[PDB]
């Protein structure tokens, strides 16, 4: 079981960490949503599906930089809404195909009342999301750590 991003960055068997740079909506009004859809960037496969099924959760997530300071929001995992930052583990997603299939994570963030000007500086760390893989065969309990970086400024006009 391993995970790849669109831009080529990979975390191999056994887990690890990676830096993912995501393009953001250059401007977001107070009361609009900013969406960070990792389901179109992170894809995971099962390396021996004939005997084993892999179990994937969003174990925990934290906000940093402008997302921490200037945004409230939730995370959507496989169709359900969860608090963000998430302090508790999500239900499991099954992987039993060699075919790259998405990690169904998307952040829904709204600027806060007092937000104004550059609310996310380009190149800054905006979140850390921990993917936890287990299986039905082994004692394997791996963490794939995704450090989420902003590719561009995000402006909240006032």
Ligand X SMILES: CC(=O)N[C@@H]1[C@@H](O)[C@H](O[C@@H]2O[C@H](CO)[C@@H](O[C@@H]3O[C@H](CO[C@H]4O[C@H](CO[C@H]5O[C@H](CO)[C@@H](O)[C@H](O)[C@@H]5O)[C@@H](O)[C@H](O[C@H]5O[C@H](CO)[C@@H](O)[C@H](O)[C@@H]5O)[C@@H]4O)[C@@H](O)[C@H](O[C@H]4O[C@H](CO)[C@@H](O)[C@H](O)[C@@H]4O[C@H]4O[C@H](CO)[C@@H](O)[C@H](O)[C@@H]4O)[C@@H]3O)[C@H](O)[C@H]2NC(C)=O)[C@@H](CO)O[C@H]1O
Q: Which of 88, 99 has the CB closer to ligand X?
A: 99
The reply to whether 135 sits near ligand X by the rule CB under 6 A is yes
Choice between 137 and 158, CB closer to its own copies: 137
Looking at residues 118 to 157 of the shown chain, list those that interact with its own copies (rule: CB under 8 A).
Answer: 136-140
User: Would you give the binding string for its own copies spanning residues 56-85, x where CB under 8 A is met?
Assistant: ------------------------------
Instruction: Find out whether 91 and 80 touch, Cβ atoms under 8 Å.
Output: yes
Q: State the virtual CA torsion across 116, 122, 128, 131 in degrees, nearest 10.
A: 120
Helices (H) and strands (E) in the chain — how many of each?
1, 15
How far apart are alpha carbons 63 and 85 in whole angstroms?
6
Both tokens of residue 121? Answer: 């500086």
DSSP type of residue 41: T
CB of 84 to ligand X, least distance (A): 27
Site string for its own copies, 8-27 (x = CB under 8 A): ----xxx-------------
Element holding 70 (H helix, E strand): helix 65-70
Q: Which residues bind ligand X (CB under 6 A)?
A: 1, 12-14, 46-48, 52, 54, 135, 137-138, 140
């Amino acid at each position: 079981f391993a995970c790849k991003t669109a831009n080529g960055t990979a975390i191999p068997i056994g887990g690890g960490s990676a830096n993912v740079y995501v393009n953001l909506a250059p401007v977001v009004n107070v009361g609009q949503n900013l969406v960070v859809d990792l389901s179109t960037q992170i894809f995971c496969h099962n390396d021996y599906p004939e005997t084993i099924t892999d179990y994937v959760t969003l174990q925990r997530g934290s906000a940093y930089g402008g997302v921490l300071s200037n945004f409230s929001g939730t995370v959507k995992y496989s169709g359900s809404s969860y608090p963000f930052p998430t302090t508790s583990e999500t239900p499991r997603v099954v992987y039993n195909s060699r075919t790259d299939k998405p990690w169904p994570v998307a952040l829904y963030l709204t600027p806060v009342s007092s937000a104004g000007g550059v609310a996310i500086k380009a190149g800054s760390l905006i979140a850390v999301l921990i993917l936890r893989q287990t299986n039905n065969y082994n004692s394997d309990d791996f963490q794939f750590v995704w450090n989420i970086y902003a590719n561009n400024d995000v402006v909240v006009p006032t």
